[PDB]
Amino acid sequence: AYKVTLKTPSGDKTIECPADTYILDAAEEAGLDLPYSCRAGACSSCAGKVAAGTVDQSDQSFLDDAQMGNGFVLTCVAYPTSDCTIQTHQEEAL
Ligand code: FES
Numbered sequence: 001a002y003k004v005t006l007k008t009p010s011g012d013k014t015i016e017c018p019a020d021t022y023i024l025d026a027a028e029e030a031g032l033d034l035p036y037s038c039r040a041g042a043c044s045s046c047a048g049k050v051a052a053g054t055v056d057q058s059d060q061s062f063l064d065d066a067q068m069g070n071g072f073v074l075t076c077v078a079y080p081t082s083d084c085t086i087q088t089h090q091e092e093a094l
Helices: 023-028 065-069
Strands: 003-009 009-015 045-054 073-074 084-086
Touching: 003 023, 009 023, 065 073
Parallel strands: 003 084
Antiparallel strands: 003 009, 045 073, 045 084
């Protein structure tokens, strides 16, 4: 699996996520407690910010082009495509 380093307000936690699993789902399977609501890619509750590595969030609808270009990600609909580092709890930085 890809190693996903979640940089959270309570420290960095690196977890495993296969290519076919959403970031948010892997984090909750690993025991993290990340923000979410709709789980459909249509809000900002689950927003993270990619510091390194790549994700595929092609089904997302809520972020604009500039936000995605700055690394923002909806973790509920994002698959990893490499080992990656994602700051969590980023909704208020949008
Ligand atoms: S929880 Fe709404 S987009 Fe992820």
